[model samples]
Target chain A: LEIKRYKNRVASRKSRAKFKQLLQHYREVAAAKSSENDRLRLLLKQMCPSLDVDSIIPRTPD
Target chain B: LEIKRYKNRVASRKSRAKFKQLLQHYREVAAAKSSENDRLRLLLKQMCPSLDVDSIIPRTPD
Candidate 1:
């Protein structure tokens, strides 16, 4: 009986919009945090003047 | 060789927890930013009564 609703729209457009909005926000925040981290590393080097923060950061596989 | 696999597994648990914690942090930050953007759009609409910010958001399929 209610199959008509399903026929016209199989999935929720509202939920899809929300998911995309959330994903974009997540990506933006991650990029901002990474840039902030880079700035912090530069500042820390200026303050310490000799400490190698490079060793502190983990070396990950490319 | 067999002993090494077991050792790697045990060590990986700690690494797993650390990785999960960081991922959770990123997820939470992302969620917060997403919610904040939604609020800002609503507020702008309330202020201007015609500003449509939802159109800028992307459409996603479930």
Candidate 2:
């Protein structure tokens, strides 16, 4: 029983670590996407001042 | 021993659920970002036919 418990703990720790790694990866991609979205929005606004770029390109949730 | 094992299983299940929820949320945000990125790329390409928008907007890994 002790050995089984120890193994379970080890497995749990590994699982948590893997999940954390995935979360970090997702965060990095999301940040990059957000930055690119902002850049494009600004460019669009500049190129077409007459158009309501903000309305067309909605803001993402915070 | 049975009680301890039961508690551990419950904890593991809860942790898994939370991780799954977060993963789903991240997937959604990423998908939205990808769609917006594609849309903006199209707009930019249209605005500046001479410019290679693909070069400006790098592709995300699959």
Candidate 3:
């Protein structure tokens, strides 16, 4: 009966509250990172002076 | 000559500092969401009493 209840609940619900919340919160975290990239790079450079940050770029898909 | 030199530098520099900064920030956001799924579930439960938390875990894609 419990499993059936869960199945019914999941099947009927198209929008999941937890997942939505997680996505919203996660996006904010990501946005914050976008705003602070210069600071992050400077810190990374300090820690790994020899590391070629430019080489880290991923090639775009055709 | 100066414009040509700048164009050559784009090909030679290997790293775009701004781009790297964006990637790192985005990854942090993605990581935070993965780690905070459970916390997010609890928060959602508090907001929507009828919502099913267990069913929120996405089924693995085939």
Ranking by TM-score: 2, 1, 3
Return the number of clashes found in candidate 1: 0
Residue pairs in candidate 3 whose N, alpha carbon or C atoms collide under 3 angstroms:
A54-B14, A54-B15
Can you tell me the DockQ of model 1? Answer: 0.07
Candidate 2 residue pairs in clash (backbone atoms < 3 Å): none
Show the lowest summed lDDT stretch of 10 residues, model 2 chain A: A53-62
Interface RMSD of each: 12.8, 1.8, 14.7
Q: List the candidates ranked by lDDT, beginning with the highest.
A: 2, 1, 3
Candidate 3 docking class: incorrect
In candidate 2 chain B, what residue range of length 10 has the lowest lDDT sum? B53-62
lDDT of 3 at B35: 35
- Model 1 lDDT per residue over A1-62, tens place: 68978764656766656656665665667555444444444544554556565574431211
Model 1: colliding residue pairs: none
**Model 3 chain B weakest 10-residue run by lDDT:** B53-62
- What is each predicted model's overall lDDT from 0 to 1? 0.52, 0.79, 0.48
Residue B47 local lDDT, model 2: 75
Residue-level lDDT of model 2, residues A1-62, one tens digit each, is: 89999999999999889989898787788888888888778877777778787677677753
Against the true structure, what is every candidate's RMSD?
Answer: 15.5, 4.4, 21.7
TM-score top scorer: 2
- Candidate 2 stretches greater than 4 Å from native: A1-12, B1-16, B54-62
- lDDT winner: 2
What are the models' TM-scores?
0.41, 0.69, 0.30
- Estimate, for each residue in A30-62, the C-alpha lDDT of model 3 and write its tens digit: 454333333333434554567554355321111
- Interface RMSD for candidate 2 relative to the native interface: 1.8
